[PDB]
């Protein structure tokens, strides 16, 4: 199934994944297309944060769902 | 103007469908960076919809 | 006596209870009136969370007191 990741810049990335895929792997795929480190990649879904050690089936993430990419920079 | 501020805030409003719009515009004037604004919300710098 | 329960939506309901009433019983009333499962009913009073197996007098809850009802949405 294909999903759509929306970036804060208004960019829409299309990713081909399966319900059995892990959140960690999804972010790794984004690093393959964009290059952004998964450590700084906070995946949010409908306002809820997706735990790295989870699957798409855990949050009922279906196809064509919008994945929110949140950034984080703690320097103080 | 607040044109760019609104545009940036609305983007975050789509990411977090449970955050006060006026509070988003608030941090947007302080940090002026979506990379830190949305982060601040997740950390707990922004007040959530709590009854009182 | 009467108590006021306020939800995250701002909605406020008045519940008929007595000091001898248990929190578990009170939340059960909300479960039937609003349809909210007790498993997702988090009753907070004065910043402190109330336990199910406790009475209203256990926390010295007086009449016309406002209780905060927070939901627990996990897996959705």
From Swiss-Prot, chains A, C:
Outcome following mutation: residue 44 to D: Impairs ubiquitination by CRL2(KLHDC3) E3 ligase complex. Impairs ubiquitination by CRL2(KLHDC3) E3 ligase complex
Residues at the site labelled Essential for function: 68
Modified residues (Phosphoserine): 65
ADP-ribosylglycine: residues carrying this PTM: 76
Consequence of changing residue 60 to R: Decreases affinity for UBE2R2 in CRL2(FEM1C)-UBE2R2 complex
Mutagenesis / variant outcome for changing residue 9 to D: Impairs ubiquitination by CRL2(KLHDC3) E3 ligase complex
Effect of residue 72 to A: Impairs ubiquitination by CRL2(KLHDC3) E3 ligase complex. Impairs ubiquitination by CRL2(KLHDC3) E3 ligase complex
Glycyl lysine isopeptide (Gly-Lys) (interchain with K-? in acceptor proteins) crosslink site(s): 76
Bilayer topology term: Peripheral membrane protein
Effect of residue 63 to R: Abolishes HLTF-mediated polyubiquitination of PCNA
Impact noted for substituting residue 66 to A: Abolishes CteC-catalyzed ADP-ribosylation
Protein name per the record: Ubiquitin
Lineage: Eukaryota, Metazoa, Chordata, Craniata, Vertebrata
Residues of the full protein shown: 1 to 76 of 685
Curated annotation (Swiss-Prot), chain B:
Residues of the full protein shown: 453 to 504 of 643
PTM comment, free text: Palmitoylation of the RING-type zing finger by ZDHHC6 promotes localization to the peripheral endoplasmic reticulum.
Subcellular location: Endoplasmic reticulum membrane
Domain CUE: 4-46
Stated role: E3 ubiquitin-protein ligase that mediates the polyubiquitination of lysine and cysteine residues on target proteins, such as CD3D, CYP3A4, CFTR, INSIG1, SOAT2/ACAT2 and APOB for proteasomal degradation. Component of a VCP/p97-AMFR/gp78 complex that participates in the final step of endoplasmic reticulum-associated degradation (ERAD). The VCP/p97-AMFR/gp78 complex is involved in the sterol-accelerated ERAD degradation of HMGCR through binding to the HMGCR-INSIG1 complex at the ER membrane.
Domain notes from UniProt: The CUE domain is required for recognition of misfolded proteins such as mutant CFTR. The VCP/p97-interacting motif (VIM) is sufficient for binding VCP/p97 to form a complex capable of transferring VCP/p97 from the cytosol to microsomes.
Name of the protein: E3 ubiquitin-protein ligase AMFR
Quaternary organization: Interacts with RNF5. Also forms an ERAD complex containing VCP/p97, NGLY1; PSMC1; SAKS1 and RAD23B required for coupling retrotranslocation, ubiquitination and deglycosylation. Interacts with DERL1. Interacts (through a region distinct from the RING finger) with UBE2G2/UBC7. Component of the VCP/p97-AMFR/gp78 complex that enhances VCP/p97 binding to polyubiquitinated proteins for their degradation by the endoplasmic reticulum-associated degradation (ERAD) pathway. Interacts (via the VIM) with VCP/p97. (Microbial infection) Interacts with Staphylococcus aureus HIgB; this interaction regulates AMFR-mediated inflammation by promoting TAB3 ubiquitination to promote TAB3-TAK1 complex formation.
Tissue: Widely expressed.
Disease connection: Spastic paraplegia 89, autosomal recessive: A form of spastic paraplegia, a neurodegenerative disorder characterized by a slow, gradual, progressive weakness and spasticity of the lower limbs. Rate of progression and the severity of symptoms are quite variable. Initial symptoms may include difficulty with balance, weakness and stiffness in the legs, muscle spasms, and dragging the toes when walking. In some forms of the disorder, bladder symptoms (such as incontinence) may appear, or weakness and stiffness may spread to other parts of the body.
Signal sequence interval, chain numbering: none
Protein species of origin: Homo sapiens (Human)
Domain of life (superkingdom): Eukaryota
